[PDB]
Structures are given as C-alpha cells and as structure tokens.
Structure 1
Amino acid sequence: FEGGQLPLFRRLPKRGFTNINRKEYAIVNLDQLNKFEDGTEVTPALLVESGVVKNEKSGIKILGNGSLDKKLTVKAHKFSASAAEAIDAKGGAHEV
C-alpha cells in the first residue's frame, strides 16, 4: 500500500507466457569428470549413483566449462558444441 498513489506493480505491464512442454536438463561440466578412471564408461545411470547428479530432471547434458584431464567414453542425451570438441581431443569418443 502506497497511501493512495497507484502501486508500482499496477503501473507496470505484464510480459511473456509459460510453455507447458518445458524440458530442462541437468548440466555437468567437463570439470566434474576428473574423478573416474582413465578410459572408463560414463553413463547417466552411474552419474546419478556416484554423487555427481543428485536429480536427473529430464536428462543429462554435458557442457564444456573446463578441461577434462582424462580419456573417457561418455553417454548422454545432449552435448555442448565445446563439450564434444574437448572430449574427442583427449581420446575416446562420445555418443548419444
């Protein structure tokens, strides 16, 4: 209440809408993959029980905010344009 003057929210207009088919992903940067053995196979079923991903909302997406430091084979739903650039540069190969 502003004592009679129009409130700020009444003065401002509404914006946007919501999507019913909103899909979200659990991001995992290239920094959280420095604990597994060299050449190991990383799968969402493992990341959810190893301690990296607490809740897989609608899939695991791998980003590239950092260096891998190991040669692994990763299995995920989506890969960043820079996540695969550095995963295939340290050896191994990714897959969807």
Structure 2
Amino acid sequence: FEGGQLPLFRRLPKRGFTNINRKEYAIVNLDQLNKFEDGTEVTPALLVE
C-alpha cells in the first residue's frame, strides 16, 4: 500500500500467458557425464540411480 498513490503493481501492465502444455526437461551437462567409466551406456535409469 502506497497511501493512496496508485500502487506499483497497478500502474504496470500485465504481460504474457502460461502454456498449459509447457514441457520442462531434466538437464544433464557434459561435466556430469564424466563420473561414468569409459564404455558406459548412459540411460535415464542409470542417471537416476
């Protein structure tokens, strides 16, 4: 509340929307794959385990 001055989150516009089908991925970088031995077969099950 700003004492009756129009508050900041009313003087600014709304923007955008939310995608219902938004896909978010789990991310593994190359540096995190360095913990496996040479010749390993990397799989989501192995990354989770």
Which structure shows the bigger proportion of residues in strand conformation? Answer: 1
| Number of residue pairs matched by the alignment | 49
Q: What is the RMSD computed on CA atoms of the aligned residues?
A: 0.7
Distance across 2 between alignment mates of 1:3 and 1:20: 38
Deviation at 1:19, TM superposition (A): 0.6
Larger radius of gyration: 2
Q: Structure 2: where are the runs of 5+ without partners?
A: none
Q: Relative contact order (C-alpha < 8 Å, sep 6+): which is higher?
A: 1
Identity of aligned residues (%): 100
Distance across 2 between alignment mates of 1:39 and 1:19: 40
**TM-score of the superposition, structure 2-length normalised?**
0.92
Which structure shows the bigger proportion of residues in helix conformation? Answer: 2
Deviation at 1:4, TM superposition (A): 1.3
Deviation sequence 1:47-77 (CA, Å, 0-9, x none):
001xxxxxxxxxxxxxxxxxxxxxxxxxxxx
Deviation at 1:37, TM superposition (A): 1.1
